[PDB]
Design an enzyme around this catalytic site. Structure first.
Site, PDB file in Angstrom:
ATOM      1  N   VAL A 103       0.049   4.846  -2.659  1.00  0.00           N
ATOM      2  CA  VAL A 103      -0.447   6.075  -2.438  1.00  0.00           C
ATOM      3  C   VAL A 103       0.826   7.173  -2.819  1.00  0.00           C
ATOM      4  O   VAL A 103       0.483   8.147  -3.685  1.00  0.00           O
ATOM      5  CB  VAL A 103      -0.768   6.074  -0.922  1.00  0.00           C
ATOM      6  CG1 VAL A 103      -0.920   7.713  -0.491  1.00  0.00           C
ATOM      7  CG2 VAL A 103      -1.788   5.194  -0.610  1.00  0.00           C
TER       8      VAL A 103
ATOM      9  N   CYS B 167       0.576  -1.368   0.066  1.00  0.00           N
ATOM     10  CA  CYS B 167       0.172  -0.080  -0.024  1.00  0.00           C
ATOM     11  C   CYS B 167       0.932   1.186  -0.099  1.00  0.00           C
ATOM     12  O   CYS B 167       0.454   2.045  -0.681  1.00  0.00           O
ATOM     13  CB  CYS B 167      -0.929   0.100   1.245  1.00  0.00           C
ATOM     14  SG  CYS B 167      -1.615  -1.371   1.727  1.00  0.00           S
TER      15      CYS B 167
END
Ligand SMILES: Nc1ncnc2c1ncn2[C@@H]1O[C@H](COP(=O)(O)OP(=O)(O)OP(=O)(O)O)[C@@H](O)[C@H]1O
Ligand code: CFM
Ligand code: CLF
Ligand code: SF4
Ligand SMILES: [Ca+2]
Ligand SMILES: [Ca+2]
Ligand SMILES: [Mg+2]
Lengths: 522, 476, 267, 522
Positions: D156, D152
């Site tokens: 981002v 993750c």
């Protein structure tokens, strides 16, 4: 009653209160049945140590065998030779049973025939049925070969199969050159495994005894493979695969594999695959003959070593890890070919599953039974995995055998807590699992009831049954798996670790009671 | 469909060397709905020709197999070698209630395990010690049936005497039943031998005992081995009709239940070939009328439900109708659901001595027409009851052999077929839907009303199952 | 090594005539064995010296199974180094003797009772009642059969009857009637009459054995005539029967005669 | 307490009255737990139809998934290419989970590395760790290739893996020619199956995109085989066996089999087998590429059809009978080689088992779940056997998928009683087996709890769990079996018929109660 969109069969139907009522009125009405009290009592009794000694002091009655007669083991041998006809000299009901039986296990066609010997046969002997029967059968089902077998009926009357056959030839019923091997198969002697020997050896001779003079030991440089009574096709296939991937020349004498598994594609095939006579004929020319299960092929060895002059290997049934490397190693010593890197990997992959599964299997106490080679095999591999082979029963085993096994048990620390049992039937083992309870049982479908009886006593006393062996009627398509060599050993192991893991899941699936040990991973 | 079966038969029978040729040609003939005997049309119950793949059993299959085995409170000793017993342990699905090992001993197998020496020296001496070992290891055993095998019949042992001595000694009934394999052509003798075996050692014991009350309704179900529960599926209707079901011969049977048959008002016989013999001694010695009935499907059971009724008073008759009314909506419901699927679909059968003629009615109701049948041990009197239940071109076989049957199947080209285990697979490979009839293919009760329901469903799951369409691979 | 089976109607003289033939054959320095294929168990009693020793079937009973027996237990040496073994059997009216014959023979063969020693192997076969008592004459058992007979209407009916049964195993196999051995019951014209039957049969009358009471003297004293009275008249006779058998080359396929042709002979 | 010669572990120990006492005092003393009454109540509630609607109206909370993130599916893809290193750009705990997870299933080593992106990484991007990490890893574990992935954390902060990689090259950390494919693997998007696509395609490009100019369609006359996220080694092996016994040329792009099964023989092997780059490089020269599980290889197809210009076949996952003949037929259409008599037999042998087992399997209502290809596969074959696929859940499935499955159900009558479920988690299926109860469930170990919860309600409500899929932690060595093609279909079937047979044996083993239907043979 029965409602259309939710039809209740055998089980839910008699459970209905309407039916329960009925049965009660029948029971209290005309059965003159004992009161549950004493029924529970007598049961409570049988499940004791007092009953066990009584049980074992037994000498004339036998309750639930772990064996069968020789004719059944003969027929399976014959199914192996290409286009042959299991032919059984004697009664017809036996052939009717031999067939029905092999059906429920393999779940495929079982062809076999019989001279139907009627009452007169016993009185006058059985010459015309043998004469005609050989003709009729040979004329109807068009075999390339017919291998004669016999029931008690022919044994007592002492019908000379040999003579009977030859008259028919001279008398003009069947082409004198038509292959018709025979063996006397006294159902009242030895066991089904024995039949296989007598039946096999019979044929080993028909094609070689006369033509021994012109054959050289190791003329075709191949390795003979003698199965013995074997009902797991996976085993026939697996043994062929290894030798084959070794580049080893071999000849499997008596190979059931195609015939017991003819595809359902629209065409019925009475015969398929099988060992060619020309192949059985040329057997002597091989380097050496190997006997996978030698404990019921004792009469074969006598012949092979004696007539063929083969230096038959002192090998054990290829089961578990050690016995397999030994099998392959010896094949390697003989064919000349190396143990392929392929097979070596396989081995290591098996030892991997052992190290990986060793925790769960370690220390699990088992009770098991089957044929002499199987049990001797299984037991062995059980010590390898580190399980205690507590009660080992073999109903058709013998003294020389028993001792051999004990010794295999004297070797490992896991085995010193196990006892052997020969000439003892299932009903004996029902006791063993009660007085000194197992974890599980490893046998045929017949062990379904020893299981049930342990449950009636108490869920905590129930002994689950792991089905390895023969027969296996209450389950489907197990006949296709393997129990020999590395391959078949990968399975034996998984079957147990997961047999154990399952029980632990059931013993511990109680909400807010036993479920704390319901580990997601094991 | 006229003189074809004849061109069929004489072609199948073409391969048979003349010794067998003449013989077989007389076991299979075209059925004329009109004859009332087969001495003229077909022949049954004769010796089987050698090496021909018969399914026929032996006299044993009749005594330890069908008749005695089924008695739950007794211990049937399979006297002789170790093969017969083991092969038939739990083979037949005749259900029962009880505590096996303790009270009942049916899924169990007791054998004298004959060895080399037992045969040489003969062995009643072993049989006796063995009749002892039971009384002591299985106390709740309520009697012992000694089923003989072939060796005993040759060796010449007095299993008749021992059973008198041990038993006279142990104060327990012991039936010296003789069912030697080498005896009789089929399994048939086994029955006749069993029947008699029963009127002699078991049946005639409660004769001077009247502590029992015969009711104008008391009866016994004779010849319902209760395969799958058929005996209970029928004992329910009779009782729901007001009759009092007292006995049941072989099928969750009680040794005592068999002993009370003499006191009943009527003997209801489903299986004619097996207990027809006994039912007559049942009527001569004791004087108890008996009748034949049929509980396969609506129309048969419904019909029969009335026949057994008329043998009593009007009282039971109005009660009977109530039973018929009750199930009327249920069985009608079944037909409405399945007949649509089975309609037109023809069927071919092969069995022993009852179902061959007794299942057709169950079929008529479902719209499956039967184009072929046969028995493996029935007689002319058994075919006498068949011709009528059949159509005209219909082909019939008696002790049909692999070649004989297989070629008919290959030619008549049936949608569904029903026979035993030995045959179940031969045809399942020719992509012809097969449904075991002997063992009901381990499926629920077929007799009675509840039974018909399962049947009508079992023909549907097999016949119309997806499997069949998947036989021949695309590339072919 | 030859194997000859000796048949006959019981009570004519199978055992003495054999045990005396081999006694003589022993004398000639031959390695001989006597398999007793008879329930009576007296086929060796005259060469060993007693009522009878431990038989195969009787012995195998003790060990539970025949496969549990050892040749060492049934095989005993006797006079002139003659080996002996009995088939054993049940008692009058029980069991199956025809089986023992099978079980015992299979055992000897199975345990290699044949493989390394003998010149002659004699099967003393009792009554030819059924399947089992034919065991001595299949392939690998006996090739020569010597039916024993006398001048009695029933002694021959048997000599004839037996040979008939033989044609069954003779056509299909190699076993052959070598000849008849006559023990004169001192019936009239008994001598040639037998020779007659041996012809209408297709065999020879190997030799003629006298009725000499030295056989009871030997029988009751627990021994053969050849060890009992070596020079006695019938001692040599039994030596002649032995010599003739040894040198015999005539082995045929019997040709039974019919009751009619039979009674014709006598008549 | 614990006695030496009979040591009671986790489950027997706390059962002892001494321990029960303890727990009761803890409970009544400091847990402030609700009274069983309302506990039983709330439970009774959840097991209802009222609770179900509430359950399904759900739209933000998720309870017990049936999917995983993308990086996990990437790593498995990589393991496939020879001597490559699953490299994951981001956090280090992610790979620590990715690993631990793949262990429990295969239970062999799982190598994978990560640039441990600490807090600073998120704040300043992740350049050095990518730079160094590529160097360190490449230097320590000596790969031939490293296929970069991402947790993750990088998604981002949008680290450009491409740029990041190339700098490291130019900046001189790793040989500019060293193979280092990459693919953004947004764990917060799609599912694990998706990662496998992105990861694969990434590589399918690295070795082809630039070199497209000199490759000819069908230059090596072979057939490409793209497996996709597959965890049953038996399936990799079986697909290779068939093509191979057809004499068909092929290339399994992404092949875990050796590496996930390294023999324990004393030598640890970080790598084994795998697809060679030189093999992946030459891919385009094949006749055509085959995608065993198209439903999660949608991005691959776009590339293969687009860049390689391959006329990719419209095949479904090779499961059950029909979808296998179709697979083989098409391969036959391409390779040129015919369908070997060998394979045809196999087929017929499978149809044999069907006709033979059809009775028990007919009408059995099942509830199942797994990946989109699996479920679509399994379901299919379930109709073939004649079972009702009542509840079909697929947590990571989509619309185009769902409606392709419905249609497969519209065809057979055994499918008209089943509903599909996508974007629905396990906790939803817990309800479906309660309101409309199956016979059994066919899923992973996670379905061990839905099973337990059904039992707490009532033994007559318990739904046994048949383990097919992924994960499978509570059992051992199932990873070696097969679920694809004939072979893997022989198994699926046996596993049910015997799954059913077993239950019938348990439901019916009560003495003098239900044991009457305890048929010895079935
Ligand atoms: N040479 C002989 N002359 C007269 N009688 C003899 C002679 N040899 C034997 N016997 C008498 O024959 C009788 C039986 O002899 P033997 O032992 O040969 O019997 P057998 O019939 O052969 O025995 P079995 O048939 O029981 O095997 C005895 O009573 C014996 O005295
Ligand atoms: S084949 Fe009945 S005469 Fe007998 S075992 Fe079956 S069609 Fe029998 S109804 Fe019966 S309960 Fe049977 S089904 Fe007469 S008992 S020897 Mo094989
Ligand atoms: S008709 Fe002897 S052990 Fe029993 S199966 Fe035989 S070979 Fe074997 Fe019927 S009574 Fe029995 S099944 Fe007579 S012998 Fe067959
Ligand atoms: S006549 Fe022969 S086979 Fe028959 S019982 Fe007597 S000894 Fe045995
Ligand atoms: Ca089959
Ligand atoms: Ca591992
Ligand atoms: Mg004598």
């Amino acid at each position: 009653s029965q409602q259309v969109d939710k039809i209740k069969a055998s089980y839910p139907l008699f459970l209905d209160q309407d039916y329960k009522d009925m049965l009660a009125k029948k029971r209290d009405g005309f059965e003159e049945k004992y009161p549950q009290d004493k029924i529970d009592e007598v049961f409570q009794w049988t499940t004791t140590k007092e009953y066990q000694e009584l049980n074992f002091q037994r000498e004339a009655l036998t309750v639930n065998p772990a064996k069968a007669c020789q004719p059944l083991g003969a027929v399976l041998c014959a199914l192996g030779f290409e286009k042959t006809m299991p032919y059984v000299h004697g009664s017809q009901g036996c052939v009717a049973y031999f067939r029905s039986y092999f059906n429920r296990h393999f779940r495929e066609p079982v062809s076999c025939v019989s001279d139907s010997m009627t009452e007169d046969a016993a009185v006058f002997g059985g010459q015309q049925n043998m004469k005609d029967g050989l003709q009729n059968c040979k004329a109807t089902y068009k075999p390339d070969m017919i291998a004669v077998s016999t029931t008690c009926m022919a044994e007592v009357i002492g019908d000379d199969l040999n003579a009977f056959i030859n008259n028919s030839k001279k008398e003009g019923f069947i082409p004198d050159e038509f292959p018709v091997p025979f063996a006397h198969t006294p159902s009242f002697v030895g066991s089904h495994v024995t039949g296989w020997d007598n039946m096999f050896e019979g044929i080993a001779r028909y094609f070689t005894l006369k033509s021994m003079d012109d054959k050289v030991v190791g003329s075709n440089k191949k390795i003979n493979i003698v199965p013995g009574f074997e009902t797991y096709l996976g085993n026939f296939r697996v043994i062929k695969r290894m030798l084959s991937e070794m580049g080893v020349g071999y000849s499997l004498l008596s190979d059931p594999e195609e015939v017991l598994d003819t595809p359902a594609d629209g065409q019925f095939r009475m015969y398929a695959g099988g060992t060619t006579q020309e192949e059985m004929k040329d057997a002597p020319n091989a380097l050496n003959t190997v006997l996978l299960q030698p404990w019921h092929l004792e009469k074969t060895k006598k012949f092979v070593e004696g007539t063929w002059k083969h230096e038959v290997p002192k090998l054990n049934i290829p089961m578990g890890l050690d016995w397999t490397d030994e099998f392959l190693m010896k094949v390697s010593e003989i064919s000349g070919q190396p143990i392929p890197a392929s097979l070596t990997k396989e081995r290591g992959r098996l030892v991997d599953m052992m190290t990986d599964s060793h925790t769960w299997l370690h220390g699990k106490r088992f009770a098991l039974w089957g044929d002499p080679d199987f049990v001797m095999g299984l037991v062995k591999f059980l010590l390898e995995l580190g399980c205690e082979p507590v009660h080992i029963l073999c109903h058709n085993g013998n003294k020389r055998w028993k001792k051999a096994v004990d010794a295999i048990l004297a070797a490992s620390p896991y085995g010193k807590n196990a006892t052997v049992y020969i000439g003892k039937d299932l009903w004996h083992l029902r006791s063993l699992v009660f007085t000194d309870k197992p974890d599980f049982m490893i046998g045929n479908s017949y062990g379904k009831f020893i299981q049930r009886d342990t449950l009636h006593k108490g869920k905590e006393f129930e002994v689950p049954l792991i089905r390895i062996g023969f027969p296996i009627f209450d389950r489907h398509h197990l006949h296709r798996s393997t129990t020999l060599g590395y391959e078949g050993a990968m399975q034996i192991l998984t079957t147990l670790v997961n047999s154990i893991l399952e029980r632990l899941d059931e013993e511990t699936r109680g909400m807010q009671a036993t479920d704390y040990n319901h580990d997601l991973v094991r | 469909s006229r003189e074809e079966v004849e061109s069929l038969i004489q072609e199948v029978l073409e391969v048979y060397p003349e010794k067998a040729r003449k013989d077989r040609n007389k076991h299979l003939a075209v059925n004329d709905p009109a004859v009332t005997q087969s001495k003229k049309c077909i022949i049954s119950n004769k010796k089987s020709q050698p090496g021909l793949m018969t399914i026929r059993g032996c006299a044993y299959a009749g005594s330890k197999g069908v008749v005695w085995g089924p008695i739950k409170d007794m211990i049937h000793i399979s006297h002789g070698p170790v093969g017969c017993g083991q092969y038939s342990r739990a083979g037949r699905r005749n259900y029962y209630i009880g505590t096996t090992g303790v009270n009942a001993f049916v899924t169990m197998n007791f054998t004298s395990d004959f060895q080399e020496k037992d045969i040489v020296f003969g062995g009643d001496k072993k049989l006796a010690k063995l009749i002892d070992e039971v009384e002591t290891l299985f106390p709740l055993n309520k009697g012992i049936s000694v089923q003989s095998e072939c060796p005993i019949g040759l060796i010449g042992d007095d299993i008749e005497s021992v059973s008198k001595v041990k038993g006279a000694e142990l104060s327990k009934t012991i039936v010296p039943v003789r069912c030697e394999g080498f005896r009789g052509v089929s399994q048939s003798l086994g029955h006749h031998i069993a029947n008699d075996a029963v009127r002699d050692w078991v049946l005639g014991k409660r004769d001077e005992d009247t502590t029992f009350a015969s009711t104008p309704y008391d009866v016994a179900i004779i010849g319902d081995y209760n395969i799958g529960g058929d005996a209970w599926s029928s004992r329910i209707l009779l009782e729901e009709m007001g009759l009092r079901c007292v006995a049941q011969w072989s099928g969750d049977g009680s040794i005592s239940e068999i002993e009370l048959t003499p006191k009943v008002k009527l003997n209801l016989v489903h299986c004619y070939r097996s207990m027809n013999y006994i039912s007559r001694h049942m009527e001569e010695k004791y004087g108890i009328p008996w009748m034949e009935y049929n509980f396969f499907g609506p129309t048969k059971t419904i019909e029969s439900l009335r026949a057994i009724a008329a043998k009593f008073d009007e009282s039971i008759q109005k009660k009977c109708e109530e039973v018929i009314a009750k199930y009327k909506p249920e069985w009608e419901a079944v037909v409405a659901k399945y007949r649509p699927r089975l309609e037109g679909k023809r069927v071919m059968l092969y069995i022993g001595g009852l179902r061959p003629r007794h299942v057709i009615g169950a079929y008529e109701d479902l719209g499956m027409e039967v184009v072929g049948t046969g028995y493996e041990f029935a007689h002319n009197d058994d075919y006498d009851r068949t011709m009528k239940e059949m159509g005209d071109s219909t082909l019939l076989y008696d002790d049909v052999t692999g070649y004989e049957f297989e070629e008919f199947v290959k030619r008549i080209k049936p949608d569904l077929i029903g026979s035993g285990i030995k045959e179940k697979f031969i045809f399942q490979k020719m992509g012809i839907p097969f449904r075991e009839m002997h063992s009901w293919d381990y499926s629920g009760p077929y007799h009675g009303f509840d039974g018909f329901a399962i049947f009508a469903r079992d023909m549907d799951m097999t016949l119309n199952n997806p499997c069949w369409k998947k036989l021949q691979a695309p590339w072919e | 090594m030859r194997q000859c089976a000796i048949y006959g109607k019981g009570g004519i003289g199978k055992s003495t005539t054999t045990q005396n033939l081999v006694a003589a054959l022993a004398e000639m320095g031959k390695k001989v064995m006597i398999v007793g294929c008879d329930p009576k168990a007296d086929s060796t009693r005259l060469i060993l010296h007693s009522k009878a020793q431990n038989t195969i079937m009787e012995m195998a009973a003790e060990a539970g199974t025949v496969e549990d027996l050892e040749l060492e237990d049934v095989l005993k040496a006797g006079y002139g180094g003659v080996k002996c073994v009995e088939s054993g059997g049940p008692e009058p009216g029980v069991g199956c003797a025809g089986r023992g014959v099978i079980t015992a023979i299979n055992f000897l063969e199975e345990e290699g009772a044949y493989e390394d020693d003998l010149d002659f192997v004699f099967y003393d076969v009792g009554d030819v009642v059924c399947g089992g008592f034919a065991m001595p004459i299949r392939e690998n058992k006996a090739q020569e059969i010597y039916i024993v007979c006398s001048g009695e209407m029933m002694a021959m009916y048997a000599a004839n009857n037996i040979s008939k049964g033989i044609v069954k195993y003779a056509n299909s196999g190699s076993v052959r009637l070598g000849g008849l051995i006559c023990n004169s019951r001192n019936t009239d014209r008994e001598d040639e009459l037998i020779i007659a039957l041996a012809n209408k049969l297709g065999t020879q009358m190997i030799h003629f054995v006298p009725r000499d009471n030295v056989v009871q003297r030997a029988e009751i004293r627990r021994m053969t005539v050849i060890e009992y009275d070596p020079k006695a008249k019938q001692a040599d006779e039994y030596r002649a029967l032995a010599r003739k058998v040894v040198d015999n080359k005539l082995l045929v396929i019997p040709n039974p005669i019919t009751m009619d042709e039979l009674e014709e002979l006598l008549m």
